[PDB]
Design a protein around this nucleic acid. Structure first.
Length: 302
RNA sequence: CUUAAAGAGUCAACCCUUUGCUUAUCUUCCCUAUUUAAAUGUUAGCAGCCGCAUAGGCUG
């Protein structure tokens, strides 16, 4: 007993998405993909900072980025490849006095549901935060091992039953429970309207710097890989007072709301893995949450 | 009323010169920095035109 957790214990990320490159298409002209360019407009304004009152007279020529659709294409296309990898129970930096006990404590994990919610967050449009808002038509095409799947009307908040997501979830759960990998090429086509302004992900700017950096690969608007990884693991409906699916965190913590849902109420990942290697009976939902964290990965040492 | 009581140490100056610390050196092998992640905080305070207004209203 009293199997104390290793200080070096970490797990690798098992859902690896690429950067979500963003293109402009039409709804019936889906093959002509023109890359959405981040424009950048200059704004003239004096600097106002707390530490330098002497520098407020002149300076701060700032040039803020923006990204709209072109005025001939009404559909935004978002392309990214989500790579699910198996052996989520292998610790990369941990070892096997604790990670092997985790293997033999989370073998009864229903990966079917875990994978369903992953592919449902892929398909329903959780990966399209501010640009699925106000779109009159949502479409998702998933290409997986030469199989094409079409999704039109999936409400993203609840994980309802559709056999299309389920079909992919099968091979995704077979990867995650076993050994190997699977790759889902996900292209989202959302009809926002003619010249509607799109929403790339944001680089962190300083309190000063410029107003807003949109995410650029080679000049073209895109969204962060870790931001999509936040979308995919947004499956946590099993904490106490669970209203909406949150991103599976080791503490159940969302930064933008200023509260942590699983911290400080004995449902955090660390107490559940210590309970697993000390062998108390877990329910299915918290064990699924622990396996979702191990799929997410991260260093758990102290 | 304290070995109480009391007291001017003054002055002057050439340290000189000289010098060979040289000699030769194998630092050297060895090797996992690894795994995560929403930037949120309304993230913008505009473009015309109605006017004498840098007063006050309207338009999207």
């Amino acid at each position: 007993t009293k199997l104390k957790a290793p200080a070096v214990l970490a797990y690798s990320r098992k859902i690896n998405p690429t950067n979500a490159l963003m293109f402009a298409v039409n709804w019936s002209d889906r093959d002509n993909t023109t890359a959405v360019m981040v424009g950048t407009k200059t704004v003239a304004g004096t600097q106002s900072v707390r530490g330098n009152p002497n520098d407020a007279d002149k300076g701060n020529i700032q040039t803020v980025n923006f990204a709209n659709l072109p005025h001939n294409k009404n559909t935004l296309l978002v392309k990214y490849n989500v790579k699910f990898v198996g052996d989520v129970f292998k610790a990369e930096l941990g070892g096997g006095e604790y990670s092997n006990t985790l293997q033999t404590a989370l073998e009864n994990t229903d990966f079917g549901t875990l994978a369903y919610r992953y592919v449902y967050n892929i398909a329903a449009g959780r990966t399209l935060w501010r640009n699925r808002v106000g779109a009159e038509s949502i479409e998702t095409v998933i290409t997986v091992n030469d199989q094409t799947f079409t999704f039109s009307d999936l409400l993203v908040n609840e994980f309802d039953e559709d056999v299309d997501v389920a079909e992919i979830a099968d091979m995704v759960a077979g990867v995650l429970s076993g050994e190997g990998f699977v790759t889902l090429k996900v292209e989202h086509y959302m009809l926002l309207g003619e010249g509607s302004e799109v929403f790339p992900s944001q680089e962190f700017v300083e309190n000063s710097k410029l107003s807003k950096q949109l995410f650029d690969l080679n000049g073209q608007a895109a969204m962060h890989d870790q931001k999509i990884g936040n979308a995919i693991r947004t499956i946590d409906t099993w904490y106490e007072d669970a209203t909406t699916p949150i991103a599976v965190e080791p503490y159940g913590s969302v930064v933008r709301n200023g509260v942590a849902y699983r911290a400080g109420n004995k449902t955090d990942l660390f107490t559940l893995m210590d309970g697993a290697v000390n062998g108390k009976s877990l329910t299915e939902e918290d064990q699924m949450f622990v396996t979702a964290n191990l799929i997410r990965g991260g260093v758990f040492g102290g």
